[PDB]
Amino acid sequence: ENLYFQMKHGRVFIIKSYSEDDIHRSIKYNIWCSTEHGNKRLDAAYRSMNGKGPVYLLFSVNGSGHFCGVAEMKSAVDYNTCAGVWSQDWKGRFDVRWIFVKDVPNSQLRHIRLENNENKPVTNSRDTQEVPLEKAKQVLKIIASYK
Numbered sequence: 001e002n003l004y005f006q007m008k009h010g011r012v013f014i015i016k017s018y019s020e021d022d023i024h025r026s027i028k029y030n031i032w033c034s035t036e037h038g039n040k041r042l043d044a045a046y047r048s049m050n051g052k053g054p055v056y057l058l059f060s061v062n063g064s065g066h067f068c069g070v071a072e073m074k075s076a077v078d079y080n081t082c083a084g085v086w087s088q089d090w091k092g093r094f095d096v097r098w099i100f101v102k103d104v105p106n107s108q109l110r111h112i113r114l115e116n117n118e119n120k121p122v123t124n125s126r127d128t129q130e131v132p133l134e135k136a137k138q139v140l141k142i143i144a145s146y147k
């Protein structure tokens with residue numbers, strides 16, 4: 001048995017990227033940026049957490065068929081930073097720490113559905129879709145165990 005993930009503090013968000021370049025840059029420099037509304041949502045969650053638990057980011061490139069890894073949010077959002085550092089010319093930056101870098105096919109995860117998103121498969125989420133914690137524990141377990 002593995003009962004590690006089944007912890008009652010933590011918040012988990014889907015991150016969708018159109019760009020494989022942005023993913024590589026994120027892993028290289030441990031930073032990320034979302035849309036304006038995505039940034040606001042992540043920033044609110046990080047600050048309300050007050051270090052009592054992690055904010056996890058589950059990354060997937062749009063259209064790729066797989067998640068590509070897991071990172072923890074590690075700072076609030078800085079909204080006034082150098083423009084143009086990502087593939088398309090994004091307002092701001094925050095720190096992350098990449099945890100897993102591995103491809104996990106959507107087939108491994110499509111059966112987990114999100115009650116807060118019309119019971120759609122977690123694999124059908126938009127950028128910064130939040131994941132209920134009890135579903136997030138199931139997703140993290142499948143990702144950590146995929147080979």
Ligand SMILES: CNc1ncnc2c(Br)[nH]nc12
Pocket residue numbers: 016017018019022032033034035038086087090127
């Ligand atoms: C740099 N950040 C991003 N890059 C590419 N696509 C994204 C979406 Br969709 N939301 N944030 C994104």
